[PDB]
């Protein structure tokens, strides 16, 4: 509309209305020029790719994308508390995206010093993939999302994708994508871009912890009319065989007949936080649960949803099984165990098997007069009829949605890193600096982004008499307030925050 | 009414869905020891990123597998013994063993080896290699799992998963190109020799 008239205002806040929450977030972004406007082939052998399991082939593009998949984008820590303490469930409904107050800069080195000034004729290209024709990279828990603190300015990530490969070489079925082939909108410093999205119907994420365990659902006061086999022998001696039977009742609860059985397991190795207990060998990769695809071994991470540890065993964690976040300022490579925070899904222990334990036992043979009964450990167990399980929890730092791969079939599409699986997730938003001339003007753009999500809530109806567990900040005397900036002005998040505090009956 | 049979090949593989340019914010366990010697235990962590793509956390996992014996078209490569019946994967019903044919939908062979085919796993010899993106190889183990608790006295031990049932977060493709038996329950009724399953 004009160079001297602003194209949009600054909206950040949350409105709590009844069963719904509306969270608006507005950030200031900066977009450079990537690859000097050049689509470029990339593969492992460029960096040497010494492992076959690491072999990849794909392209890096001049475009950039806006990523708001993580939760702390849309929720302040306070708003996250109000959500998790008061609600049994939630899920997104509507999405509203706006891109405005674009500004483009040109970079020049005059004499020995660098110069930057407004380029008022330059444009920015932006488009959304609403037919989902491009490779969808959002659901891989990648970096580059809007900063948790709204006062930080962030650098848009460079888009890219991969396709089929054999070793580092491509194949005849591989694909290539020119984002320029998509109709996009072009924006001058007076233009602004917006669109509205509609989440597809998904189940509420369950932000609650069961108050009953799957094997304790019985009435403790009453016997069962069913019978179990108590004795196979009368006593010590020869030819003592017998069959005795007993009522399943309160005195012995292990053997009662039950209608439902815990969810599936794929065993993880168990690592102790205290380092002395762990074995003195390099078993980090050689001892890890993996799955192989087309000859390549992928680590199983995080894997099926399973409790992190048995009750009263805080030190142990199940290797690749639990999500691990870095603390503020954490180094990229080979950091110490203290430098990172390992989350533990012990909330789901009641209905889900412990990740580091065998699912159970099965008989391996037929007993006979000449053969004793023999059993073996079930290390992994697929779905059986009558299993129940809980999904993995979502965190303030964790992902929100993923795209369900488009396939003939799937089971319980809910993604394994947590969040809402969707066949048509929020579409990707691609952006780039229009090239201004293989010799171009060095140029970058900056502007604002606002995003608005409407969340639906499931209120807590419970009749529990005694008070709940609640997420709370302790009353402490320390140098720095939690979830706030320090003296140098750095914002940090002290610990990962789970969603499961309130309880329900099983 | 039945779903549209998928007649395409994925251009991506299940494990490669990541953006190759960017790091994850997640961490993994890189080193369990500092160096060679006694009492070297440590825990070191590193960001999962493009440099090492195997260890990244992923939202979905390949479909189920029931392993088939691998057979080469070059008769010199194969063993000098009769393994057609003993070797073959079977399922037992009421005391009667039944060969598994064609079985669950699985990639016929690894990429780069086309001379091998699953014993009972193919329609006769068609190859399923189109689906090797989302499905495990019929001649391969699904993966590994830990068999014990490590400790100061015990090294970590793993074992090979030969068969794996459904897990939450699996995706798979059906066989490339029937009546649904009338039962209390079924899962993914699409028939194993291919086509459209229907209750009528």
């Amino acid at each position, epitope marked *: 509309d004009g160079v001297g008239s602003s194209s949009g205002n600054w909206h950040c806040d949350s409105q709590w209305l009844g069963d719904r929450v509306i969270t608006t977030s507005t950030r200031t972004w900066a977009l450079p020029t990537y690859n000097n406007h050049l689509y470029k082939q990339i593969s492992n052998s460029t960096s040497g790719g010494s492992s076959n399991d690491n072999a990849y082939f794909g392209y890096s593009t001049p475009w950039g994308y806006f990523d708001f998949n993580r939760f702390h984008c849309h929720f302040s820590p306070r708003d996250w508390q109000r959500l998790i303490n008061n609600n049994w469930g939630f899920r997104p409904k509507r999405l509203n995206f706006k891109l405005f107050n674009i500004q483009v800069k040109e970079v020049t080195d005059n004499n020995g010093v660098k110069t930057i000034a407004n380029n008022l004729t330059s444009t920015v290209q932006v488009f959304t993939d609403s037919d989902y024709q491009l490779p969808y990279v959002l659901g891989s828990a990648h970096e580059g999302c809007l900063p948790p603190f709204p006062a930080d300015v962030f650098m848009i990530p460079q888009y890219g994708y991969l396709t089929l490969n054999d070793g580092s070489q491509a194949v005849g079925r591989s694909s290539f994508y020119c984002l320029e082939y998509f109709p996009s909108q072009m924006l001058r410093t007076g233009n602004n871009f917006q669109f509205s999205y509609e989440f597809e119907n998904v189940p509420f994420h369950s932000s609650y912890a069961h108050s009953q365990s799957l094997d304790r659902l019985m009435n403790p006061l009453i016997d069962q009319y069913l019978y179990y086999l108590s004795k196979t022998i009368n006593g010590s001696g020869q030819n003592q065989q017998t069959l005795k039977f007993s009522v399943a009742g309160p005195s012995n609860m292990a053997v009662q007949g039950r209608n439902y059985i815990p969810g599936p397991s794929y065993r993880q190795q168990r690592v102790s936080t205290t*380092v002395t207990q762990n074995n003195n060998s390099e078993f980090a990769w050689p001892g890890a649960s993996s799955w192989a695809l087309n000859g390549r071994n992928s680590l199983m991470n995080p894997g099926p949803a399973m409790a992190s540890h048995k009750e*009263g*065993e805080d*030190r142990f964690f199940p290797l690749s099984g639990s999500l691990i976040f870095g603390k503020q300022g954490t180094g990229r490579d080979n950091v110490d165990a*203290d430098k990172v925070m390992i989350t533990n899904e012990e909330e789901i222990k009641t209905t889900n098997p412990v990740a580091t334990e065998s699912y159970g036992q099965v008989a391996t043979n037929h007993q006979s007069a000449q053969a004793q009964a023999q059993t073996g450990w079930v290390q992994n167990q697929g779905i059986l009829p009558g299993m129940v399980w809980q999904d993995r929890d979502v965190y303030l730092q964790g992902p929100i949605w993923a795209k369900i791969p488009h396939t003939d079939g799937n089971f319980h599409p809910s993604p394994l890193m947590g969040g809402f699986g969707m066949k048509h997730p929020p579409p990707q938003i691609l952006i780039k600096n229009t090239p201004v001339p293989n010799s171009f003007i060095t140029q970058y753009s900056t502007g604002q982004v606002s995003v608005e999500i409407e969340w639906e809530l499931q209120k807590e109806n419970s009749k529990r008499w005694n008070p709940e567990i609640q997420y*709370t900040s302790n009353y402490y005397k320390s140098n720095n307030v939690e979830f706030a900036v320090n003296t140098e002005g750095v914002y940090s998040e002290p610990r990962p925050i789970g969603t499961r505090y309130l309880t329900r009956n099983l | 009414n039945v779903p549209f049979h998928s007649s395409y090949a994925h251009s991506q593989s299940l494990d490669r869905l990541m953006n190759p340019l960017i790091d994850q914010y997640l961490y993994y366990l890189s080193k369990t020891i500092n160096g060679s010697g006694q009492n070297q*235990q440590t825990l070191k962590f590193s960001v999962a990123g493009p440099s090492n793509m195997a260890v990244q956390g992923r939202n979905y996992i390949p479909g189920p597998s029931y392993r088939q014996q691998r057979v080469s078209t070059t008769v010199t490569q194969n063993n000098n013994s009769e393994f057609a019946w003993p070797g073959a994967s079977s399922w037992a019903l009421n005391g009667r063993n039944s060969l598994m044919n064609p079985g669950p939908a699985m990639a016929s062979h690894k990429e780069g080896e086309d001379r091998f085919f699953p014993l009972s796993g193919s329609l006769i010899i068609t190859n399923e290699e189109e689906i090797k993106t989302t499905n495990p190889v019929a001649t391969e183990s699904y993966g590994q799992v830990a068999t014990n608790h490590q400790s100061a006295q015990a090294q970590a031990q793993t074992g090979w998963v030969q068969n794996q049932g459904i897990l939450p977060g699996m995706v798979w493709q059906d066989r490339d190109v029937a009546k649904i038996p009338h039962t209390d329950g079924n899962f993914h009724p699409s028939p194993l020799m291919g086509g459209f399953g229907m209750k009528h």
Partner: antibody
Amino acid sequence: QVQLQESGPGLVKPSETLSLTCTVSGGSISNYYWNWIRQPPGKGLEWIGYVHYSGSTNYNPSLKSRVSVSVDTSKNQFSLNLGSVTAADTAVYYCARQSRSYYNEVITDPKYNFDYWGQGTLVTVSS
Amino acid sequence: QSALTQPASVSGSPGQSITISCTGTSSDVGGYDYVSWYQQHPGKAPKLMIYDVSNRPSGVSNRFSGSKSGNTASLTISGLQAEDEADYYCSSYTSISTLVFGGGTKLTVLG
């Protein structure tokens, strides 16, 4: 109000095992980590080790060979057994409690800051 | 492991801030922010003045404070009084998840 009380023989002959028990009153053992500290008279504190109701233990590397720490949840008391004592083991033995952790969010080993302490008992090792 | 190193004694006149230090190796002190300070009156069990390097429990006055630079953590006592004379110990979490104490420091209030 949590109170700890150490009890046990005040005299131990060399090359014999030393035994002490701490009985917590007012509060149960619960999820807490119980520690043993010893102070040789006129010298600094030294940490023996701890025990957890799951039976987990962690010991001082110098004492790791000859020391053991046990817990009895039924009697609401935990114990110390130190074997092959010498005169260097004469000290005042304290039982302490690791401070309560207000968050169940992460998986970590305990970092030691003590919230409560016994009064301590003197144990002399002499022939 | 190796004990933490402290001055044997420090004295000051009432009203004057006092700083006690404990030096530790990179793995034990320098490495993590988990250093505690205990005061022990004669014949009493130690009391926890400061935990997690600079934090202090409820029941401890402003006058007690602590800080960490490199391999050395320091305890600062502001506006000290008569009741503030005791033995102060530095405690630290180590690399192998063991606890290590300083040698102890005696604070004498001149007067």
